[PDB]
Structure formats: structure tokens, C-alpha cells
Amino acid sequence: SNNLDSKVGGNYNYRYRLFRKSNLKPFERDISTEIYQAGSTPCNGVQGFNCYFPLQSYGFQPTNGVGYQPYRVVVLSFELLHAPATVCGPKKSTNLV
Amino acid sequence: STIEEQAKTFLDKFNHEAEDLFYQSSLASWNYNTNITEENVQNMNNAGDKWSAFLKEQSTLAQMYPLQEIQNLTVKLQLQALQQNGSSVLSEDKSKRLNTILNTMSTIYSTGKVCNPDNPQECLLLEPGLNEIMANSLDYNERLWAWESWRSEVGKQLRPLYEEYVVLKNEMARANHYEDYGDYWRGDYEVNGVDGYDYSRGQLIEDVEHTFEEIKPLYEHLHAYVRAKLMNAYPSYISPIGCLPAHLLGDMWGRFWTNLYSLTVPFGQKPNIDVTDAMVDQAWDAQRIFKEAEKFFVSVGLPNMTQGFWENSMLTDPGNVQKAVCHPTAWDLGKGDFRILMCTKVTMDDFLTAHHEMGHIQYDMAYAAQPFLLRNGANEGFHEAVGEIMSLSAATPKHLKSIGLLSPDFQEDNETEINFLLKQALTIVGTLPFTYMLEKWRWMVFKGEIPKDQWMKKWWEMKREIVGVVEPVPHDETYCDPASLFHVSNDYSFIRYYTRTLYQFQFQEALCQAAKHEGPLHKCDISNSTEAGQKLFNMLRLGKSEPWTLALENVVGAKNMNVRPLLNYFEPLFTWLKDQNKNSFVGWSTDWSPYAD
Numbered sequence: 001s002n003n004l005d006s007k008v009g010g011n012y013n014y015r016y017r018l019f020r021k022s023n024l025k026p027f028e029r030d031i032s033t034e035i036y037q038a039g040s041t042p043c044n045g046v047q048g049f050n051c052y053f054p055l056q057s058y059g060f061q062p063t064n065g066v067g068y069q070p071y072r073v074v075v076l077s078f079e080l081l082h083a084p085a086t087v088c089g090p091k092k093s094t095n096l097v
Numbered sequence: 098s099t100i101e102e103q104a105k106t107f108l109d110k111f112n113h114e115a116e117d118l119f120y121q122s123s124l125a126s127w128n129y130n131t132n133i134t135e136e137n138v139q140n141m142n143n144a145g146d147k148w149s150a151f152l153k154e155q156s157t158l159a160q161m162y163p164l165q166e167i168q169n170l171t172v173k174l175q176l177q178a179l180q181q182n183g184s185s186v187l188s189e190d191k192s193k194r195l196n197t198i199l200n201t202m203s204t205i206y207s208t209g210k211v212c213n214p215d216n217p218q219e220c221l222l223l224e225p226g227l228n229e230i231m232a233n234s235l236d237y238n239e240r241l242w243a244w245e246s247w248r249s250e251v252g253k254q255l256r257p258l259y260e261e262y263v264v265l266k267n268e269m270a271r272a273n274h275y276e277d278y279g280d281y282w283r284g285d286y287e288v289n290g291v292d293g294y295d296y297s298r299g300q301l302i303e304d305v306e307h308t309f310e311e312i313k314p315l316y317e318h319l320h321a322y323v324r325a326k327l328m329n330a331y332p333s334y335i336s337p338i339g340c341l342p343a344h345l346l347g348d349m350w351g352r353f354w355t356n357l358y359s360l361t362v363p364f365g366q367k368p369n370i371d372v373t374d375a376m377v378d379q380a381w382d383a384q385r386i387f388k389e390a391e392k393f394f395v396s397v398g399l400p401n402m403t404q405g406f407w408e409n410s411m412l413t414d415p416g417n418v419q420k421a422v423c424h425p426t427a428w429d430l431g432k433g434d435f436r437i438l439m440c441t442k443v444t445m446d447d448f449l450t451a452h453h454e455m456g457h458i459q460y461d462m463a464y465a466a467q468p469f470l471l472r473n474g475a476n477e478g479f480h481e482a483v484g485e486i487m488s489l490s491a492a493t494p495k496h497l498k499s500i501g502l503l504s505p506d507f508q509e510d511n512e513t514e515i516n517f518l519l520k521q522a523l524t525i526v527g528t529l530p531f532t533y534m535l536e537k538w539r540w541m542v543f544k545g546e547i548p549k550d551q552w553m554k555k556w557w558e559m560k561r562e563i564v565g566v567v568e569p570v571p572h573d574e575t576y577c578d579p580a581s582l583f584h585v586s587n588d589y590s591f592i593r594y595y596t597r598t599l600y601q602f603q604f605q606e607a608l609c610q611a612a613k614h615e616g617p618l619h620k621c622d623i624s625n626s627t628e629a630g631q632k633l634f635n636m637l638r639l640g641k642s643e644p645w646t647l648a649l650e651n652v653v654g655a656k657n658m659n660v661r662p663l664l665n666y667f668e669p670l671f672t673w674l675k676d677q678n679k680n681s682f683v684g685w686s687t688d689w690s691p692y693a694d
Binding site for chain 1: 102109116405
């Protein structure tokens with residue numbers, strides 16, 4: 001995406017969660033912005049010692065290395081449940097005789 | 098719950114915030130060097146101050162995590178640098194006055210100049226003006242006018258500014274629990290936390306002094322040979338057992354003797370290896386110069402260069418409209434962005450310099466996966482050492498004949514290589530004595546062993562004993578010789594150049610044993626050999642995250658510096674110089690002076 005997302009001066013619109021009290025569960029999304037507490041020192045939403053902001057912005061500029069260039073990822077989750085099936089592959093419809 | 102978890106958390110969030118500000122700070126300096134404009138000059142100060150104040154803000158929170166409760170070696174090393182407060186330990190006045198002395202001494206260096214005695218109207222600055230004239234100047238008075246008059250208005254005027262630099266910097270080391278400011282630079286080699294690999298700071302003075310003793314027999318013969326060729330010019334001032342004039346070293350400070358290679362050529366009846374005329378006929382430009390070097394790193398197994406690297410390179414200076422510094426430098430910013438700013442002409446040196454400038458970039462690619470604080474060389478001597486081993490392989494006739502620069506029928510024999518070793522000896526063997534001489538003097542002045550009045554008395558007294566150089570005009574304690582030097586005035590490490598010679602040769606001898614090359618060392622070529630690259634790549638990616646003593650063992654198998662590779666690579670030259678010096682006296686005496694008869 002370096003030709004779109006990355007722009008001169010950097011794009012901070014895309015962030016990430018750096019710290020969390022544990023590991024996320026499969027297919028779980030948590031947008032909570034609550035401050036991360038490293039130790040036992042109370043935070044109360046005020047940054048300080050042993051208190052950090054979990055969300056961090058990805059640095060995006062066209063001069064960055066190819067390894068760190070932003071890549072847009074589309075993950076398709078295929079799940080077959082007890083419900084009827086609908087989505088199917090394409091068709092053929094050959095000539096008629 | 099433990100401080101270890103809190104320390105690792107502070108280190109994880111520090112690499113991200115520091116990587117963004119550090120990249121913008123280095124990027125601002127790039128646009129300033131590539132193009133001189135009012136916008137880039139301010140961006141460098143804003144971006145430079147934003148990053149400079151960042152470490153000052155993080156240092157306050159770094160001292161709150163003691164290293165006694167941290168059992169991780171990689172964690173303490175990251176916090177070891179952050180624990181330092183820099184200039185914060187100094188007083189408000191001593192902290193602000195320090196930057197004024199560094200900026201004042203650095204300004205006089207660039208703005209300093211010596212007017213022509215014969216042409217008072219014309220006044221030439223030192224660089225390039227005074228550095229270029231002294232290179233090719235064969236005159237005794239012409240070289241003495243610019244050499245003697247420079248330190249008069251510089252060395253004398255910089256003495257009061259240098260005295261403050263000595264007192265101010267000492268207050269910083271004492272606040273850091275260091276014996277003195279001299280020990281501050283030795284901290285780069287400090288190794289602690291690993292059983293058996295511990296390296297004390299004070300052990301450096303003994304290693305540099307112990308290894309220099311073995312270089313004396315090689316330097317004494319190299320000095321006697323240089324004095325024999327120049328003895329016919331001035332037999333009165335040049336004694337057979339005496340020392341050579343200080344202004345005849347070939348340049349201002351006598352750091353490199355390469356300028357004297359012209360008159361010191363042992364054999365003038367045989368051609369010399371030069372790619373200048375060969376590259377001209379081949380019709381090569383700066384675009385294909387780096388491309389040819391990129392294939393060299395691939396032959397040893399090292400990854401190639403990224404597309405952005407070659408696209409963003411600066412191959413020349415587009416006139417005075419957009420001007421840049423031609424001084425070759427390897428700039429590493431971050432986020433995989435690597436660039437090199439140099440003015441590329443067609444010469445045999447630019448080809449060798451291309452491998453050196455690219456060596457720094459290639460070296461930064463191995464440890465790039467390490468944390469921000471963990472990205473660096475194991476010491477200050479490995480930066481330029483890894484780049485020299487690449488240039489030494491290109492200067493070998495075997496590598497030149499591979500790509501087609503040198504004719505395949507070129508005769509390679511003793512007469513051809515003996516002249517090549519002498520050229521490399523002046524640049525190598527010439528810097529060693531001058532490096533140990535000047536570096537050792539700074540350690541004694543900062544330690545307090547030399548009173549202020551004996552600064553110059555001990556400077557020349559130790560110069561004739563180390564490098565065997567005497568002053569044509571005696572100087573008092575007012576003059577300051579190091580004050581005029583670039584590294585001494587800019588507060589840069591001058592010891593890194595001494596260790597670079599011992600480290601670059603150790604890798605040259607170890608890498609050639611992996612490639613299974615036979616014969617003299619200077620005949621070795623690491624090209625086409627993929628076994629040596631795999632062994633060097635292991636240490637390349639380690640950086641300073643591990644003790645340099647341990648990383649050095651995985652390459653050369655040694656736990657410290659050794660001069661053995663210095664004698665073998667220069668062995669063929671030592672055997673020839675020993676015979677040519679039989680008619681002369683090997684060594685010099687410290688009791689001879691040009692003004693004392």
C-alpha cells in the first residue's frame with residue numbers, strides 16, 4: 001500500500017494496540033482505549049510512571065524500507081455451519097446441441 | 098509484578114517512539130546535506146532538538162528501574178545507555194556553557210584560515226585550502242609557513258577554549274561515577290555481566306600499549322626507509338639517527354603518509370595498478386559503479402540492496418544551485434531506509450571507496466532486526482573496520498581481473514606487490530603511531546597527570562619517542578596541537594582509528610581461512626567464496642547486543658586484540674625493508690632536534 005496509504009510527512013491514522021494484559025482470543029476485537037498498567041501503580045487514565053497508552057500509530061512514508069512498507073491485508077474466514085449453503089463457485093454453461 | 102516486567106515494557110514502548118523521532122531527525126539532516134536551503138537548516142534544528150530532548154525525557158524514567166533486579170543481559174544493555182543522563186548531571190551553567198564551547202571551537206575550525214605570507218591579500222581557509230596545498234607542497238618554507246602560522250592564531254587562541262572543554266567534560270564523568278573523562282570513552286569497550294568475557298575499562302590502556310610494542314619493529318623500518326629517500330633534500334635538518342620534520346609528513350597533521358607514496362616508490366620502472374584509464378575506456382558511470390559492487394556482496398552470501406537504496410542514491414552534485422557535501426558518508430536512518438551521499442567521479446579510489454561506503458550499509462542490514470537501542474556496532478572500531486575488509490579485497494589484482502578492469506596478462510610478481518604494500522603501509526602503519534600518540538596524550542591530560550604548563554612540553558617529548566617527529570620551531574604551553582585537529586575539536590573518539598587497524602586485519606586473516614585461500618594474505622580475495630560470508634554474517638547481525646569480546650571469538654577466535662595479523666599481512670614488506678635498511682640505522686633517537694646542534 002506504499003503507493004496509497006503512505007504519504008509525505010507520515011500517516012498516523014492507522015494505529016495498533018502495543019500492550020494488553022493478556023493475549024486476544026481467536027476472532028476477538030477489542031477497541032478499548034483504557035490505559036495499560038504495567039505494574040501495581042494506579043493510573044486512573046493519567047499517563048505517568050508504569051502507565052502507558054496502548055494504541056500506537058504506524059509510521060507511513062514513501063521513503064521507508066520495503067520490509068516496513070504498509071501492506072493491506074484481506075482475511076477471508078471460511079466457516080461451514082449447520083445453516084444451508086449459498087455462496088458457491090462460478091458456473092460453466094457450455095454450448096447446446 | 099517484578100521490575101523485570103516493568104523494564105521490558107518501558108523498553109518495548111521506547112523503541113517505537115524513538116524510531117519515529119530518530120528517523121525524522123536523520124531524515125531532516127539528509128535534506129539539509131543534499132540541498133542547502135533555509136527550510137532544511139531549520140528542520141535539522143527542530144528535528145534534532147525534538148530527538149535530543151526525547152532521550153532527556155526518557156532518561157528521567159530510565160533511572161527509576163535499577164539494574165540490580167534485572168537478570169536479563171539484553172535488558173540491562175538497553176537500559177545501560179538510557180541510564181546515562183548526558184549533560185543533565187552537569188550544572189545549569191556548565192551544561193549550557195558546554196555547548197557554547199563545542200560550537201565556538203567547531204566554528205573557529207571551519208572559519209580558521211592562514212593568509213599567504215607572500216600574498217597578504219589572498220587568505221586561504223584550512224579545508225580544502227590549507228589541506229590541499231600541504232599535500233603536494235615540496236617546499237620547506239612554504240610548508241612551514243602554513244603549518245607554523247596555523248597553530249599561532251588557532252592553537253594559541255583555542256587554548257582557553259580547550260581548558261574549559263577539559264574542566265567541563267570532567268564534571269560529567271565524575272557525576273557518572275567515572276574515574277575521569279578519559280575513562281568515559283573507554284566505556285565503549287566495557288564488558289560486564291558475562292563470566293570470563295568481562296573486559297575492564299582500564300585494561301584498554303594496557304592492550305593498546307602492549308600491542309604497540311610489536312608494531313615498533315615494523316614502523317621503525319618503515320620510518321628509516323622514508324627518511325632515506327628524503328635525506329638527500331635536507332641533510333642538515335634530517336639526521337640519519339634523528340627524526341623527520343613535522344611539516345614534511347605530507348599533510349597538515351601528518352595523519353596519513355599516502356601523499357609521500359610518489360617519492361617513496363621503490364621501483365619506478367614498473368607500471369602500477371590503476372583502474373582510472375581502464376574504467377574510462379569501459380565507459381562506466383556512477384550508476385554502474387555501485388551495481389558492480391552490489392554483486393560482490395552477493396558472491397559472499399550477503400543479501401543485495403533494496404530497490405529504494407539505489408533509487409535514492411546521490412551520484413553527484415548538481416552545481417551550486419543544489420549543493421551537497423562530497424565527503425563520503427553512510428547514512429542509516431531507519432525503517433529500512435538506507436542511503437549514501439557522495440560525489441562520484443571516475444577514479445581508482447572511488448571504486449575502492451564505493452565498497453567501503455556500501456560496507457556500512459551492508460553492515461546495517463544484518464542487525465537491522467535488533468531493537469533501536471540494540472542497533473549499533475559492538476564498539477567504535479567495528480564501524481569502519483567492516484568496510485575496510487571489503488575495500489582490501491577489491492584492491493587485490495585477482496578481484497580487478499575478475500570484472501575485467503585489469504588486463505588478464507598483467508604480470509604479478511614481487512616488484513609489483515612490494516610497491517602495493519608500501520602504499521597501504523603508509524595509510525595503515527602511518528596512522529597507528531599517530532593514533533596511539535595523540536589518543537594517549539588526551540588520556541594523560543584529562544587524567545591530570547600532565548600539568549597545564551606541560552601540555553606542549555609532553556606533546557613533542559612523547560612525539561619523538563612514539564612517531565619519531567620533531568618540531569622545527571619550538572612551542573610553549575600556549576599552543577595546542579590537538580585543538581586544530583578535526584576529531585579533537587569536534588569531540589569525537591580518536592581511539593576508534595587505532596583499533597580499526599587491528600580488527601580489520603584479524604577478519605582478513607580469519608575470513609581467508611574459511612575460503613581456503615593459499616599464499617600471501619594480500620593475495621587473498623573473498624569474492625566467489627560463500628563460506629566466508631556465512632561466518633561473518635553471524636556477527637554482523639549481533640551488533641552491540643552482545644559483548645564485543647564474545648562476538649570477536651566467533652569470527653577470529655580471539656578474546657582480545659592481537660598484532661599477529663599485522664605482521665603476516667605486512668610480512669613481505671618487512672622482509673624487503675629490512676634489507677634496504679642495512680646500509681642505514683633502524684630506529685630514531687629522541688635527543689636530536691633541528692634547532693639544537
